[PDB]
Design an enzyme around this catalytic site. Structure first.
Site, PDB file in Angstrom:
ATOM      1  N   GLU A 120      -0.381   8.150  -4.364  1.00 12.56           N
ATOM      2  CA  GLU A 120      -1.012   7.290  -5.354  1.00 12.56           C
ATOM      3  C   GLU A 120      -0.685   7.735  -6.778  1.00 12.56           C
ATOM      4  O   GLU A 120      -0.847   6.992  -7.744  1.00 12.56           O
ATOM      5  CB  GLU A 120      -2.521   7.301  -5.157  1.00 12.56           C
ATOM      6  CG  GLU A 120      -2.993   6.401  -4.051  1.00 12.56           C
ATOM      7  CD  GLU A 120      -4.178   5.585  -4.496  1.00 12.56           C
ATOM      8  OE1 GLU A 120      -4.059   4.916  -5.552  1.00 12.56           O
ATOM      9  OE2 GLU A 120      -5.221   5.621  -3.802  1.00 12.56           O
ATOM     10  N   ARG A 295       5.383   1.357  -1.499  1.00 12.17           N
ATOM     11  CA  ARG A 295       5.212   2.801  -1.617  1.00 12.17           C
ATOM     12  C   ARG A 295       6.188   3.508  -0.680  1.00 12.17           C
ATOM     13  O   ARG A 295       5.793   4.056   0.358  1.00 12.17           O
ATOM     14  CB  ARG A 295       3.772   3.185  -1.266  1.00 12.17           C
ATOM     15  CG  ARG A 295       3.397   4.611  -1.629  1.00 12.17           C
ATOM     16  CD  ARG A 295       2.136   4.611  -2.467  1.00 12.17           C
ATOM     17  NE  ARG A 295       0.964   4.193  -1.697  1.00 12.17           N
ATOM     18  CZ  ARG A 295      -0.182   3.780  -2.231  1.00 12.17           C
ATOM     19  NH1 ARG A 295      -0.323   3.712  -3.554  1.00 12.17           N
ATOM     20  NH2 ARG A 295      -1.195   3.451  -1.437  1.00 12.17           N
TER      21      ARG A 295
END
Length: 332
Positions: A120, A295
């Site tokens: 993140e 991601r």
């Protein structure tokens, strides 16, 4: 043998890492936590030592074990998305402040620290492949509380990098990308490790609730079997040639990429064909809800520092993680 202190051992990573290390003949594992149900199979092991503890309450007791050991792995943190914005202050006090104390004990006693950073941290980075050493970190305005988890973990990485640069702290940071397999952490446990996305979807299937697809569930993620993931964490502990010193290593399988929607589909498919299917309610369907789009990890640092390459295919991980879960559920 090398003494490895696992803070927050009662969980997913603690179980698998412990199994791994104990498999070897040169490690002594000290598992610290408030409970041991998740690693009870190891309590009697001659080289495993359970340590009653809590990083929010104990100060001295933990500092003691840091000095008593050689390598420290802090796994206690609140990584569940809802909580970021739900009780931000708690997430900050635990994930940031308490972990900082531990980081500081490691520098004080000159111990090695293997710290779980997060994917993140990259935020809304536009690179197709998130690179630990070159990618920029992109987050939203401060008026978007959603990013407090990301920025906190990022500050910790920088503080660690600062200790390593000005005080010779030995360390390695690792960033896991949706690790999955048997023994997933409870959705609300403050131990980092298991992919929350797949844990949530499996729970949906198990409890007969819908699989919510935020704005279509088109955001992509990468999934990693724990056998592959724990193999890399293991080599970071080995630290052959000391190649991991001062390194930041992404640990995930860039080939296992899927949107939340496709993940839901693969899980459902594996679910329907499973032997214990009939013990679970009927599928409630996919609900499109509308209140980071990709991601993918660069794994060059893992190739280099660990000579590691993920070997388990998406389906295999899917089938094994679901299987284990379904056969572990208490139907009564």
């Amino acid at each position: 043998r090398t003494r490895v202190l696992i803070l927050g051992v009662n969980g997913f990573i603690g179980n698998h890492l412990t199994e791994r290390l104990l498999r070897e003949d040169h490690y002594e594992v000290y598992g610290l936590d408030i409970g041991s149900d998740a690693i009870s199979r190891f309590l009697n092991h001659p080289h495993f030592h359970f340590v009653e503890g809590d990083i929010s309450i104990h100060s001295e007791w933990i500092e003691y074990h840091v000095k008593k050991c050689d390598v420290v792995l802090p796994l206690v943190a609140i990584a569940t998305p809802i909580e970021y914005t739900r009780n931000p202050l708690r997430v900050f006090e635990l994930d940031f402040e308490e972990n900082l104390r531990i980081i500081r004990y490691c520098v004080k006693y000159r111990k090695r620290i293997i710290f779980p950073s997060t994917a993140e941290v990259y935020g809304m980075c536009s690179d197709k492949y998130f690179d630990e050493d070159h990618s920029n970190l992109i987050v939203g305005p401060v008026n978007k509380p959603r990013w407090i988890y990301s920025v906190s973990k990022q500050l910790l990485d920088r503080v660690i990098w600062a200790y390593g640069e000005k005080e010779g702290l030995q360390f390695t940071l690792f960033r896991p990308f949706n690790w999955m397999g048997p023994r997933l952490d409870n959705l609300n446990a403050a131990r980092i490790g298991s992919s929350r996305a797949i844990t949530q979807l499996i729970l949906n299937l198990v409890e007969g609730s819908p699989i919510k697809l935020i704005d279509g569930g088109k955001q992509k993620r990468c999934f990693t079997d724990i056998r592959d993931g724990i193999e890399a964490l293991y080599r970071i502990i080995e630290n052959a040639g000391n190649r991991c010193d001062g390194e930041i290593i992404n640990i995930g399988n860039p080939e296992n990429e899927a949107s939340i929607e496709e993940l839901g589909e693969m899980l459902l498919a594996s679910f329907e064909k499973h032997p214990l299917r009939h013990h679970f309610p009927p599928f409630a369907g996919f609900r499109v809800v509308e209140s980071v789009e990709h991601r993918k990890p660069s794994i060059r640092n893992a190739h280099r520092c660990l000579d590691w390459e993920p070997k388990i295919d998406m389906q295999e991980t899917i089938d094994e993680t679901l299987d284990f879960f379904l056969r572990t559920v208490d139907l009564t």
